[PDB]
Amino acid sequence: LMKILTERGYSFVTTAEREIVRDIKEKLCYVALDFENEMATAASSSSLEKSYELPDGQVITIGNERFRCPETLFQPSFIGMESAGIHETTYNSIMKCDIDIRKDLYANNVMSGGTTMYPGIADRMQKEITALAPSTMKIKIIAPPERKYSVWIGGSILASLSTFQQMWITKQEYDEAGPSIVHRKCF
Amino acid sequence: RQLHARVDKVDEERYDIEAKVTKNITEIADLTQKIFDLRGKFKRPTLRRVRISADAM
Secondary structure (H helix, E strand, O other): OOHHHHOOOOOOOOOOHHHHHHHHHHHHHOOOOHHHHHHHOOOHHHHHHHEEEEEOEEEEEOOOOHHHHHHOOOOOHHHHHOOHHHHHHHHHHHHHOOOOHHHHHOEEOOOOOOOOOOHHHHHHHHHHHHOOOOOOOOOEEOOOOOOOOOOHHHHHHHHOHHHHOOOOOOHHHHHHHOHHHHHHOOO | HHHEEEEEEHHHHHHHHHHHHHHHHHHHHHHHHHHHHHHHHOOOOHHHOOOOOOOOO
């Protein structure tokens, strides 16, 4: 996004400016269910543009860049990465598992963390994986409102489970072994 | 001596009912253990105090 906004005439290079671009993405961006159709209109009309307030009273108006940036999730080549995207990774994680595993993984794709809040992402991911998946099979995405924070919650759940109170490295075992112990005790 | 045979065999039998109820108790423990699993699946997520420090400050 810093580079695409440069193309539009707004240079963001310093720390304050870099923090703003991150904030712009968080408030204005989305992925879109259908990139090409979304770009066909975003690239043609102001009706798909949104203005962001820069903290000096000036504004920046962003159009198809609003989705072309998040689109990197489906097209990593946008940042020089060799990858077919997040739906390829989801797909191969299912495909490389045994066929009696795959049915349960297809039905349980889990969104966690940020980017999962972008408009079109839960629907787009389900569409992108079902497109690679065999027919008959049900492909489904889990994407709760506990977005961007559910992993913290999972931390809270695990830390407080009775099943987990034997999983702790104690300050006895650590002092005797040193930090390499974490490799044997955690996972 | 009939009593001695009786106490031999009935000692055996009370030890046997002992072991039978012992297996009943062991299987109560094990089936109720997998049942602890079953109901924990359902009840563990709430064994937690939540939404305390959210606002008080």
